[PDB]
PDB file of C-alpha atoms in Angstrom:
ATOM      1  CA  UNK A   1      71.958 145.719  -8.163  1.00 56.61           C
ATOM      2  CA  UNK A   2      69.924 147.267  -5.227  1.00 59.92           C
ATOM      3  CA  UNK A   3      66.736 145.327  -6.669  1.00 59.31           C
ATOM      4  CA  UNK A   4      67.791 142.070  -4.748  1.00 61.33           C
ATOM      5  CA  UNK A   5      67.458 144.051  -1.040  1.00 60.21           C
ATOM      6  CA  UNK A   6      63.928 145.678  -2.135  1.00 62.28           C
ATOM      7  CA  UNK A   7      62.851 142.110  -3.131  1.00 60.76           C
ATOM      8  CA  UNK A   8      63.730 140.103  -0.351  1.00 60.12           C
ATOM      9  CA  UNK A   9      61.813 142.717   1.591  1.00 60.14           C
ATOM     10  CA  UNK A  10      58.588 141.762   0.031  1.00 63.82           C
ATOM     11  CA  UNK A  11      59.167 137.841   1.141  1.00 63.70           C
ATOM     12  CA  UNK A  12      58.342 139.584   5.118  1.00 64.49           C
ATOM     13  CA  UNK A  13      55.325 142.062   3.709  1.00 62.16           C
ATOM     14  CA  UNK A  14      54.340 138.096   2.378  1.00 62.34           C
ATOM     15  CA  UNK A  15      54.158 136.694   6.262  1.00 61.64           C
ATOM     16  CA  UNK A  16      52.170 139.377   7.664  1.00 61.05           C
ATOM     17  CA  UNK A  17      48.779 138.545   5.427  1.00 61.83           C
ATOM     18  CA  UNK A  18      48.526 134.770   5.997  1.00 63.00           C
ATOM     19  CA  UNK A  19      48.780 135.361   9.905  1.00 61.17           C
ATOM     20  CA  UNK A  20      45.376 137.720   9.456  1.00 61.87           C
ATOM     21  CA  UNK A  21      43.300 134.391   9.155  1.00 63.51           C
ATOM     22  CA  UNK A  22      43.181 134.074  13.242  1.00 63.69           C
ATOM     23  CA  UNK A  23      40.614 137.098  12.534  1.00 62.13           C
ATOM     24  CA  UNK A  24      37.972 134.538  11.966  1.00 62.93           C
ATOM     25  CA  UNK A  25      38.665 132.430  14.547  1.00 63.16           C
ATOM     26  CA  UNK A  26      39.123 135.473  17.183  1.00 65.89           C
ATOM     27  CA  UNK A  27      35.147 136.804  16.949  1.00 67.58           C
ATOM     28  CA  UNK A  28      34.708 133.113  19.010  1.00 69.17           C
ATOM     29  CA  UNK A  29      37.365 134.394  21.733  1.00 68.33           C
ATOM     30  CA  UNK A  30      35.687 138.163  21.367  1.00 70.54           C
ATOM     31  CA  UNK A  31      32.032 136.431  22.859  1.00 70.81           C
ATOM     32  CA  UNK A  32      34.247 136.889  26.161  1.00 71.25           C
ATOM     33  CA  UNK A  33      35.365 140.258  25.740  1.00 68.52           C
ATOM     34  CA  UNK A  34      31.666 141.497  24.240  1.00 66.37           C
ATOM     35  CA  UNK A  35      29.721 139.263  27.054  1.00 64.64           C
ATOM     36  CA  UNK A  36      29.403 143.235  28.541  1.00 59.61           C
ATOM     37  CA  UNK A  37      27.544 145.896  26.877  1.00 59.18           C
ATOM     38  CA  UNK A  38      29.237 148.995  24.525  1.00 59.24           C
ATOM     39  CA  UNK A  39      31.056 151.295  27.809  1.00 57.51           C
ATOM     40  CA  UNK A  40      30.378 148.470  30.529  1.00 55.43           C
TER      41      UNK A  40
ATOM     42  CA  UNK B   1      59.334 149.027 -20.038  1.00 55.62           C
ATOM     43  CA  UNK B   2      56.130 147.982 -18.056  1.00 54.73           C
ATOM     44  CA  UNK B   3      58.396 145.999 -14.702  1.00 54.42           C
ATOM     45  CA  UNK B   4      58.920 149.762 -13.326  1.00 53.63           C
ATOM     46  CA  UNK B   5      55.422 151.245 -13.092  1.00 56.14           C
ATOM     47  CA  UNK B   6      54.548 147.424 -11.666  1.00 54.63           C
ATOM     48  CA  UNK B   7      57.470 147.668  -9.219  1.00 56.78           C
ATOM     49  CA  UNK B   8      56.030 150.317  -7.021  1.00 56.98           C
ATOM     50  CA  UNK B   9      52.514 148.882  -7.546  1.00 56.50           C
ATOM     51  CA  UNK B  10      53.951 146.122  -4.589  1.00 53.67           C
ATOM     52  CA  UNK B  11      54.545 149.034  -2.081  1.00 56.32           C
ATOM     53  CA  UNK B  12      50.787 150.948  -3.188  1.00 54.15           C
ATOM     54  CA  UNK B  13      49.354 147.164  -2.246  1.00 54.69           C
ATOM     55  CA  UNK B  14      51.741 147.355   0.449  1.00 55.53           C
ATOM     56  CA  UNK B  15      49.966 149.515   2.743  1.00 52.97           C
ATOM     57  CA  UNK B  16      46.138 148.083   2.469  1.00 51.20           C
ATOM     58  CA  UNK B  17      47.377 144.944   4.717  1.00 50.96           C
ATOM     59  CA  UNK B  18      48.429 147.083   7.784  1.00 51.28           C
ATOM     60  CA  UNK B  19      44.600 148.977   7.371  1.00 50.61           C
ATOM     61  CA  UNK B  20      42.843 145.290   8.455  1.00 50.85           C
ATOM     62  CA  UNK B  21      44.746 145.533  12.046  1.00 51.74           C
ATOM     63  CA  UNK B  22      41.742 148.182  12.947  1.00 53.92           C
ATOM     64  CA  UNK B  23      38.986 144.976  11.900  1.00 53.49           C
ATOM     65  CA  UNK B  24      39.100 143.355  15.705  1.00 54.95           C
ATOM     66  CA  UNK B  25      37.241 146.810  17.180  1.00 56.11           C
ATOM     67  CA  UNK B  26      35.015 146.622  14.272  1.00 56.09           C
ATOM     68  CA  UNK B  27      33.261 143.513  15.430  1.00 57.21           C
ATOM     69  CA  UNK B  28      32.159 145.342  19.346  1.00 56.63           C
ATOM     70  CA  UNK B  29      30.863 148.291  16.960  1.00 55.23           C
ATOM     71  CA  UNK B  30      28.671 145.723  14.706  1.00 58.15           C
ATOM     72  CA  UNK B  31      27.488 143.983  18.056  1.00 59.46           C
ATOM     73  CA  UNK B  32      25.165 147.264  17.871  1.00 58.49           C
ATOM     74  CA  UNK B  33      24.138 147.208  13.801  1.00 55.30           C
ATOM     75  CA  UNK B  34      24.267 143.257  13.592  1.00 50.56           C
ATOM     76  CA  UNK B  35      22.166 143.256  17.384  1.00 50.32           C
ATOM     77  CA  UNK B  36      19.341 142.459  14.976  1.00 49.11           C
ATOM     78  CA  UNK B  37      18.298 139.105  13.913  1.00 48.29           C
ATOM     79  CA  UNK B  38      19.742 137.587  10.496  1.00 47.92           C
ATOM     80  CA  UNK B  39      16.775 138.503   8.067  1.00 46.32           C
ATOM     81  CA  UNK B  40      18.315 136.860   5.086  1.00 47.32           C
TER      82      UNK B  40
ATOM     83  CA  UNK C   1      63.757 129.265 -11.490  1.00 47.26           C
ATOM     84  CA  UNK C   2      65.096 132.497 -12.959  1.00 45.76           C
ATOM     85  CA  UNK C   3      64.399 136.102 -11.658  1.00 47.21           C
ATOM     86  CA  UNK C   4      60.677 135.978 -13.804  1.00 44.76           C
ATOM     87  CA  UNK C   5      59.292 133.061 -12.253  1.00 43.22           C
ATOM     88  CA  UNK C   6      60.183 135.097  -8.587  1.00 44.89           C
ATOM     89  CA  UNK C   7      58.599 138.170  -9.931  1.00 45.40           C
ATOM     90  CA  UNK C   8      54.778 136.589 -10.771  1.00 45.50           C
ATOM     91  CA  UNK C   9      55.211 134.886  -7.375  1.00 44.42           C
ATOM     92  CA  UNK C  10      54.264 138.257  -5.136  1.00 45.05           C
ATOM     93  CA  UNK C  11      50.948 138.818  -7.960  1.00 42.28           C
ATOM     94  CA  UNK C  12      49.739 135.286  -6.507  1.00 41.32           C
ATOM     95  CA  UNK C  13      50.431 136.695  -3.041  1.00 42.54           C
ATOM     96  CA  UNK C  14      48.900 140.175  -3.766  1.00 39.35           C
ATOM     97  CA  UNK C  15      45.248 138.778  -4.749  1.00 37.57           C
ATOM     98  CA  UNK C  16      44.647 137.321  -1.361  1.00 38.54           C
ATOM     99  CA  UNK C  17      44.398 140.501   0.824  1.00 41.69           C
ATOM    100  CA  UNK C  18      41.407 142.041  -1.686  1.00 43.03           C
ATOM    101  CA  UNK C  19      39.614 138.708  -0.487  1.00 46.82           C
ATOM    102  CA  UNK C  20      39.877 139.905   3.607  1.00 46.63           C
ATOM    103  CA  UNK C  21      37.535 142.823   2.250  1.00 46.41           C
ATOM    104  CA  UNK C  22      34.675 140.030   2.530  1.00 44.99           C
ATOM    105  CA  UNK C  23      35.430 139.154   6.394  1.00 44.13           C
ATOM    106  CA  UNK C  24      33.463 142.384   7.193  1.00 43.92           C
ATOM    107  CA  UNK C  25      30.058 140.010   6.124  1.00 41.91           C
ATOM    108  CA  UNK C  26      31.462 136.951   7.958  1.00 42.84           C
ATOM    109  CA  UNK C  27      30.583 139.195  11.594  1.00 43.82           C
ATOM    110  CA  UNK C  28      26.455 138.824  10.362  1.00 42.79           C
ATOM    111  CA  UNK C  29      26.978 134.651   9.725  1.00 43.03           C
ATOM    112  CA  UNK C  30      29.027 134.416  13.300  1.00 43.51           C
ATOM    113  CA  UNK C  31      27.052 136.441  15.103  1.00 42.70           C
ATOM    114  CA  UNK C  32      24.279 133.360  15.281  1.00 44.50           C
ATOM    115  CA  UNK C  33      27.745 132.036  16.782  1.00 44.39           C
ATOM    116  CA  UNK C  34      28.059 135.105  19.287  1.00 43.53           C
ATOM    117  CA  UNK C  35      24.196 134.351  20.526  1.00 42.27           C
ATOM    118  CA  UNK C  36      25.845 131.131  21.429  1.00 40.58           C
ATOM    119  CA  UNK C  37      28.216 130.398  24.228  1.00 41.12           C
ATOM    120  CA  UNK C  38      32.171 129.271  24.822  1.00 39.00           C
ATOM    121  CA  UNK C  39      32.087 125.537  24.427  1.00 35.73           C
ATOM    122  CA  UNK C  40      33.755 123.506  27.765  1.00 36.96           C
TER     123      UNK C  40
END
């Protein structure tokens, strides 16, 4: 049936949300881009 | 019989994991409201 | 192996996004670490 090509599509909606853990680690990198003050 | 109303329930959960994309600007905005020093 | 144990599989997957929520608290704890400056 149809069911197997809507589940397989899930499997990529599955590697989007364990990429989102850089988040953490990119407030270090963001000292950089908020070393200036809110509108320069 | 229960698997059909849970089917859909994938694509409602779906769409929260695109809304966290918008978190990196959130940290220049709490700069300003987290400015202050940790009081806890 | 069959189609069941592949259905449960995406519930596993769909309670880690509802813990990202709690990243928003995680700028207040690094922002003792955004006082502080790029290592190197």
């Amino acid at each position: 049936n149809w069911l197997w090509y809507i589940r397989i599509f899930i499997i990529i909606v599955g590697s989007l949300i364990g990429l989102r853990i850089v988040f953490a680690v990119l407030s270090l990198v963001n000292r950089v881009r908020q070393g200036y003050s809110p509108l320069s």
